[PDB]
Design a protein around this ligand. Structure first.
Ligand code: NAG
Ligand code: NAG
Lengths: 391, 99, 99, 49, 49, 49, 50
């Protein structure tokens, strides 16, 4: 049961409406149907559309200065017209000894060719509701236990999109299940940018799920996709005070850490090559149990004397007890599972979350159940275990 | 001339040797030799564990991580301090001649 | 006298900064000849634990964070070994009586 | 039979290989390699020089 | 309008081809312009209203 | 610049019938453009001889 | 996609009018220039309001 692997879980009692969330799992249950674990596995898009690029670290070269004495009018450079230059126009105190004919405020202009430094870009991308994919996963809640790093061979997958349709998954021997997930009921994607930096950074997130307005509000130099020059390149360049015929251009350094410090309280997002994944989000989805079938209801009870504990009854940390038994034969069997209170002396109270538990050759030993508070005894044939249930 | 270097600061860390150790909820603290080495950053925390997390019991297991952390090359901000016994003030004078 | 990379072509050689503010710079730091950084934690974030993972993240180059806090601050020149103030004063008596 | 050991405590320490380092009133912190080792106790303090 | 939502309300539900049968389809549609698709077959359709 | 009697190289043609969806024209070095013309919302053919 | 965002600016000295700036009859001005270098280039076009 995949839903034991997560500390966020819910339980639901022929068709059912669920909200499925990233980082959540539902064990679906119904009378005479095998229970199912169901989750939203991923939300992603292949190569979502770029919005604005930003520059985090400017590169400055080909600095030029021109100055004019106190009454000869404004100094000028041809570079004040050219694209990809940052310029400042200022007044310089000039006189004799700066080799003017006159004393007063001269005019000075400084211009520099201001590109962006290699890999120092913050790139925005935005999702399309007509190209985003919601992956939903299902597994039959059999008596088989697999680790988080193992795969229920009965684990089945459905991909939902606006063009995708009510899908039937064949749950192996357990019949079939019908699924309809409404992607339009899910995430408000227009409020989001997948902010990205250098993807190759080993000690950083691949992306951040930033708000739409916040990404437009950044005070950095910026451009739209494939443009050859940067808007607002002043935002990474300071110009000094002028001294005679000179003024200094100061490169305001790498704003990578400035951005990272401002990405506080922001959810990460994952990039798998071309696939851009959200790590928070949900879908309303409709599930149908009409064609599910319980396996092996025709089997004999296994011999009560031939069980052993492989995993002793243990609290799951949900309200449910979990256990695993090993039987000495290889017989296809029902398991004689019951629990009885230290109260009513024979009434069974084992509310199985794994209904009709069965052993088969190389499978079926795992059981999950809810119990009433106070002392109980759990029985699995001749296996017994006293159980105090919390309350 | 050569005022005394005070505190250096590091502007950008060079991070390496991220090592992790973790334990199941009964077994108390997870541990690394890193925690006692020079030039490492470490954090100790609690991670949810259970069956299939290759662990005996459902609860919170101790986890410790340690990263080796030098300064990036030439990413230092050095401070210097003046000494009143070695500082020089320079005063200059010129006669206000007709030159 | 706060000093970064002397070879930075598009920065001041140094800045004249207040002693308390300099000791309040929120970064990893060490004295001259010390081998390893105090407070190396300040440039590392740990991502919330996942089973047997906790995520070591390098908080990036803080040079631009410093330079924003050094905008408009008085420069200091460095003529090789000589560290020069560019603001400040002295009091003198000038004797005219033998001119 | 054999209940699981929790915490051990030490009742009596055995101390060996004491080292000291010191510095003059403006040379910043004194340091030892043993501050960055396992199984050492260290104190840092100020002394009138 | 809605660029990918299917609106073919089939009166012939689960249409299937078999050897010598199954090619005919009947459907209701929403008013205004639509495109009908049958694999790579397409046909623009103005629906009355 | 080509005269009205002269053909621009990058002239690209799309023939919208009823059997027609979003059509892609490759504009040489200028990338691709795509067109969908809604033929049933063009001229009112029922009123026209 | 824009063609030729990566090309160098052409030599400002080497332009000649082939069709002088003319009022199109729409709200636009049209013109054609001949450039005497062989180079692929961006054209250094600009206009200034008095
Ligand atoms: C799953 O992870 C655990 C971690 O301890 C490992 O022992 C086990 O072999 C893994 N199983 C496989 C086959 O990936
Ligand atoms: C167009 O007409 C002009 C005369 O007005 C003629 O010289 C030219 O050859 C014609 N054809 C083309 C392709 O320009």
């Amino acid at each position: 049961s995949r839903c034991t692997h997560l500390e966020n879980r819910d339980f639901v009692t022929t068709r059912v409406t669920l909200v499925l969330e990233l980082g959540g799992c539902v064990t679906i249950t119904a009378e005479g149907k095998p229970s199912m674990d169901v989750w939203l596995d991923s939300i992603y898009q292949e190569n979502p559309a770029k919005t604005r690029e930003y520059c985090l670290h400017a590169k400055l070269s080909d600095t030029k200065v021109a100055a004019r004495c106190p009454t000869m009018g404004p100094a000028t450079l041809a570079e004040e017209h050219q694209s990809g230059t940052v310029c400042k126009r200022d007044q310089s105190d000039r006189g004799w000894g700066n080799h003017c004919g006159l004393f007063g405020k001269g005019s000075i202009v400084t211009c520099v060719k201001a590109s962006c430094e290699a890999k120092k870009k913050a790139t925005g991308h935005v999702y399309d509701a007509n190209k985003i994919v919601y992956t939903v996963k299902v597994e039959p809640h059999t008596g088989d236990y697999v680790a988080a790093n193992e795969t229920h061979s009965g684990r089945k997958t459905a991909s939902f999109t606006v063009s995708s349709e009510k899908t039937i998954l064949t749950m192996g021997d357990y019949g079939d299940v019908s699924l309809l997930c409404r992607v339009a009921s899910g995430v408000d994607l227009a409020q989001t940018v997948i902010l990205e930096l250098d993807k190759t950074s080993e000690h950083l997130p691949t992306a951040w799920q930033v708000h739409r307005d916040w990404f437009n509000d950044l005070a950095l130099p910026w451009k739209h996709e494939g443009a050859q020059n940067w808007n607002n390149a002043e935002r990474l360049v300071e110009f000094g005070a002028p001294h005679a015929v000179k003024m200094d251009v100061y490169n305001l350094g790498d704003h990578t850490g400035v951005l990272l410090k401002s990405l506080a309280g922001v959810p990460v997002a994952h990039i798998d090559g071309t696939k851009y994944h959200l790590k928070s989000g949900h879908v309303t989805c409709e599930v149908g149990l009409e064609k599910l079938k319980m396996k092996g209801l025709t089997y004999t009870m296994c011999d009560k004397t031939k069980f052993t504990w492989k995993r002793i009854p243990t609290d799951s940390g949900h309200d449910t007890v979990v256990m695993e038994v090993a039987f000495s034969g290889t017989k296809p069997c029902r398991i004689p599972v019951r629990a009885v209170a230290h109260g009513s002396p024979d009434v069974n109270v084992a509310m199985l979350i794994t209904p009709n538990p069965i052993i088969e050759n190389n499978g079926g030993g795992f059981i999950e159940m809810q119990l009433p508070p106070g002392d109980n005894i759990i029985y699995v044939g001749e296996l017994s275990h006293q159980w105090f249930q919390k309350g």
